[model samples]
Target: SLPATHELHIFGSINGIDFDMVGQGTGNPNDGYEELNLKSTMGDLQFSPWILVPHIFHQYLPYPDGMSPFQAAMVDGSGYQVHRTMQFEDGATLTVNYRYTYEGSHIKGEAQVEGTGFPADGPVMTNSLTAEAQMADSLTEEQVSEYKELFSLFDLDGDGQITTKELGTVMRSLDLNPSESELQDMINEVDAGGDGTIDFPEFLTMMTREMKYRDTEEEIRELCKVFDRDNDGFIVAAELRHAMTSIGEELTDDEVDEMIREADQDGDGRIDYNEFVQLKMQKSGMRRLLKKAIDTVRAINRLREGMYFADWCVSKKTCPDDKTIVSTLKWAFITDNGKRYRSTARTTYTFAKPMAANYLKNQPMYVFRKTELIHSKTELNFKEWQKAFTDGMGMDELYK
Candidate 1:
């Protein structure tokens, strides 16, 4: 079997929010190393690596070397080290530390990261992760109170427990109807007794602490700054490659190109701030819906007896799904022969422009890790964060 009989999700985030990436891994070095060695390597056994792409990196805090952040060493009674770095786009830094202990039949990993850019007090999810069992928590008094207030509002009947109807009622009132499982998870948060209803204590517990997410654009800006080391106001392939190398994951030219393609609306062969925002929007899971929204407006007119929808199967006659059927009939409104309304036939240039510039500039950033707010600040100043490198402040130094 695998190193750990248990499985878990690995998460990491900046001190506040704005920019965060997520991925998964097992506790096996060969398994873990396979993913980290690409661009996310730690240089050698001594240095830690940081990858920048989505679904590739997983480093936990308080535990130093991410050589295998997720996988256990696999060598019985032996220890392992994992290394990872937090790279903002522009220019900012912090400290990370880790320790590994090997018992006869089990091993342990612990890591600490300086919270220079994290929340001041409370358990912020600076080192966000999830075990199959229970997860960590980071909540404030105000956050707690607000959740309690909302639970009462969700409890429509004025009874002690909140039912699915009440949740649906609240969701409908807010125009945010959710599926059955989605609502069930909601109850699971406060339903400590698993009775399917959220009692007052359960409600408060769930509201105040169960679900915690927070962020800011400052973090995003700095991360973007980290990526655009040249300060050219754009992210180029070389800079991306280098940043990932410094942290660990290297990217192929095509992988880099694919990343740029995701939000490279203007086709400038580079990524701008607005485009970066679009990338964030895509990361937040809005890309599919946004694409659907825009594609709905694209109109194509064929110069034949009747017009056909661009995305529809013209040859197939059977009416299938309702959505497809509706869209085909709706967009095929102009059915007449003439010069087409849209151009095609040996097109010289494929036309593609990015979405409206800076539309999501002001939207909140999304994070993959379940950041747990800690009680202490990272304690390092902006300019002073690099001392971990020049001085003997990194894990290798402290452990030695």
Candidate 2:
């Protein structure tokens, strides 16, 4: 784009900072962490609750965050797998299974991905959204104001309701990952007398604690009911967005073309939000990044444990063995100064605990190459046209 005033530049407001605007920013701190929506019935998902989830993911680092803003990279594990336990309507139980793939790094198989964290009911679970908010430094006044507006709308009594309970629900649906215990505590605090819902007056007192959000409607001095899944008051933003993403409502190709046309401003063959919301979104300010973001994940979700394929990319003319000229693939990070940042420049991580084999020297070299090739092609590459290397990370870690 053009400047913020440009009609064609929809992304003008998208600073290299937090997306929330006005005072609506709730300051949700994730600590460079994001929960992936692996599986959920009524709850939310954080991608790498465990470090391995980060290692096993297709990219060298988690998306957007790992690139700009924080300037750090996240790498997924090459030889790991995920297994979900059976889930029932009444509750959910998750387990993890881990597998090690190389000489550089190896993790004894994890039984579950997130590994069924203890129930949220545990005595004041350590994980709290308060911590996230406290950790969040990117929030701006504009974003904070927007959050206040969100909170104001929910105060059904026009009294401005907001308690820990109401905020918990709002956080989840907004893609903020709070600990189960953290969310539950607020639910109990505000929902007096065992009623499932929180009255406006009770919620108003809760807002006194500060850092609340409300951007719509009057009846709800708290979170929107649609956002308040389980009606328990712990809102999971994913749960809210999931309903929209899974709409799977029938749409003809022509309709899709029209949608693409409308949302695809500049007619550059891509649908930006300007045209996207008119067709899919119900709320104007509220947006959906899941389809695009999740697609980044689903793309590399291939490769079950123990299975391998021919490398999508390869290097026949071997480069030198040493670090500089090594045959390893290179992941270059183009920074604000136009400097390319990178890591050890290899396929897999240089593990403190060595595994039986390595990426280039390992049995599944092709698989590792394929993973890098794909990751480099993702939208996450801010510099554009980045590709994979045989012995290098597709790109380097961002330079400090």
Candidate 3:
């Protein structure tokens, strides 16, 4: 029988620490075959040094005879669960329950682990773990092979390990000039067991880390391009506002200014690529802004059914357009919850004009009442505005 090949990607929090993993394997799950390889990166567990660790599970078995077989259930178009217990040399036992659904070429699942030394908060789910089978023709395999060849080339003495000198020589050959100390530091980064030399596994780990770093850099660059707008390699307040507003997460001028100030390391009133990367990596101000936007959206949805025109209106005589009214309302809610500053009104309205128009179109009486009231008064106060718009609408909550 032909063997099955799979590439697995898993990402989620493990014991409150962010974790990401990529695994590639080829085997028959039912016959106890085992040839799975995994590389995982775990976020800082707040250990002493506080550094990201790229851990590798050299060869892992998806299913062994010791654990319950899932092949039968999988073939029957049903979900299956497998409980595997790992006994460590330190006498600690770890039990993981993998629950998965097979959908032809793809398998989606969650793994929950519990047991000794684990947090008491019950089993922690690895939010998402997806495995795509028969993906033999992928770039990852090519990258791995290329990295191996590069590592072999770097091993000048052919000792299956790269020393600091070897690394320096290879780097200089490639036109990269690193100081002796910097090269040592690079070697120390992925060198397991305090070995000064880089073995094949360590080299792979380093390459994987570099690949991930480059991928993140590319992603950030793409985002920066989106906000740059003018291709000047800088993100100004207008560009930031435009990007945020276009994404439906409109920011006030003050918020945008604050964002720029926080990210502008050179105090230039704008964010350059380096400063933007710093801002993104630190996630300090950007996280807060995103959280605020998300909270505003959530609060708006909560008040959607009970919201009335009076809730949005601040002035008695001047009636802002539907979009302005909605923006004001959103700002009010945001400020009312916390002492956050008001955002400058953006023309983009996520859920105001269309919603109101639809409601009025459904209840023609409200439109007639609004027109009659507008005709009757030169300037309507809040009381009259509320009565004209939501008099018989039966929505009681004005503002919260």
> Which prediction has the highest lDDT against the true structure?
3
- Sorting all predicted structures by lDDT, with the top scorer first, yields 3, 1, 2
Local lDDT at 166 for model 3 = 78
Q: Rate the local accuracy (lDDT) of all candidates.
A: 0.33, 0.28, 0.39
lDDT of 3 by residue, 1-400 (tens): 1225544454444344454545554544334343434454554222111011111110111222221113333444443334444432223344444445455634444555433432332111211111111222233554555456555556878999887897677555434576888767666655785878878877555433312012334445445664576998887777766655533456767777777777778876777888876665452455455333222222122222122222232211112442221111112111111111121111111222222343223221111101101111111111111122222334222321
- Candidate with best TM-score: 1
Name the runs in model 2 displaced over 4 angstroms: 1-147, 150-163, 171-179, 182-262, 266-400
Q: Which stretches of candidate 3 lie above 4 Å from their native place?
A: 1-141, 210-400
- Which scores greater on lDDT, model 1 or model 3? 3
Better of 2 and 3 by lDDT: 3
The 10 consecutive residues of candidate 1 with the worst lDDT sum are 380-389
Q: What is candidate 3's CA lDDT for residue 399? A: 20
Candidate 3, residue 368: the lDDT equals 10
60-119: candidate 2 lDDT, tens digit per residue: 222122221111111122232322232212232333232323222211221223223333
TM-score of each: 0.29, 0.19, 0.23
* lDDT tens digits, residue span 235-311, model 1: 77786566445322456677667766776889888888777656543421223322222211110000010111122
Clashes of each: 57, 84, 2
Measured with C-alpha atoms, the lDDT of residue 118 in candidate 3 is 29
